[PDB]
């Protein structure tokens, strides 16, 4: 309604957040024809406090004629906790898989760095040309690997889960999730809508993929603790993995 600027989180972060946070924006800048996407306006922008650190969430989204919500937040307890997050959901018009990026650190480290273009399918299959794309691409070396939880059959088996251990594998990391989105825009921008029936389909997969990261993501735990459990509940079925209606 009337608006002040002040500068994005990004700056306070760890450099690799920061980094992909600018590349993602970048991509989408340059593939997409974006619109602002509206929060309700208490939760763009969100302090609070944890253990006396402060805490600040910073929600960042956007739309386009395929993704009904693209969604990067950023957020920092103290110096304590580092998290980058970053969703794109598809209009279930389009048989497009869901990226999803996550980055965890504190401390000039990070614990826990994921990246994938999960199936919009139960099957778990990918598009043909997203195969084609994914399998072309240099097969990186990562030395510490994780292994996914069994919640984690939602992700393809294209996703990337590591702690990265030097500064080579942090831009390993960073020039993979940007051959990702590189490959998910093409795929964006060269889909057609499918048949009311195929959406109804569409449609599960996306279920299927939000409710499990509901049930399973961790920033639940801190938000909680921040919060309240309600507070923390409303926040992921509302803001972070909200039902594609």
């Known amino acids: 309604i009337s608006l002040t600027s002040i500068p994005s989180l990004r700056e306070q972060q760890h450099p690799l957040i920061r980094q992909l946070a600018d590349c993602i924006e970048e991509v989408w800048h340059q593939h997409l ?41 950023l957020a920092k307890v103290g110096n304590m906790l580092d998290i980058l997050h970053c969703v794109m959901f598809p209009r279930p018009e389009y048989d497009l898989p869901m990226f999803g990026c996550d980055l965890v650190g504190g401390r000039g480290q990070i614990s826990a760095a994921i990246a994938d273009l999960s199936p919009v399918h139960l099957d778990r299959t990918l598009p043909e040309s997203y195969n084609s794309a994914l399998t072309s691409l240099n097969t990186l070396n990562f030395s510490q690997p994780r292994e996914l939880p069994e919640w984690g059959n939602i992700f393809s088996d294209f996703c990337i889960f590591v702690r990265p251990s030097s500064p080579e594998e942090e831009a390993m990391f960073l020039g993979r999730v940007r051959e990702f989105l590189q490959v998910h825009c093409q795929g964006a921008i060269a889909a057609s ?41 409303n926040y992921m079925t509302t803001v972070l993995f909200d039902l594609p209606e």
């Open 33 to 73: 024809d974006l619109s602002p996407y509206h929060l309700p306006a208490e939760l763009g922008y969100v302090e609070g406090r944890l253990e006396g650190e402060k805490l600040t969430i910073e929600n960042r989204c956007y739309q386009t004629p395929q993704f009904r919500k693209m969604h990067l937040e």
């Open 193 to 233: 809508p499918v048949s009311a029936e195929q959406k109804q389909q569409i449609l599960a997969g996306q279920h299927n993929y939000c409710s499990k990261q509901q049930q399973n993501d961790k920033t639940r735990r801190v938000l909680e603790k921040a919060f309240g459990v309600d507070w923390a509940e």
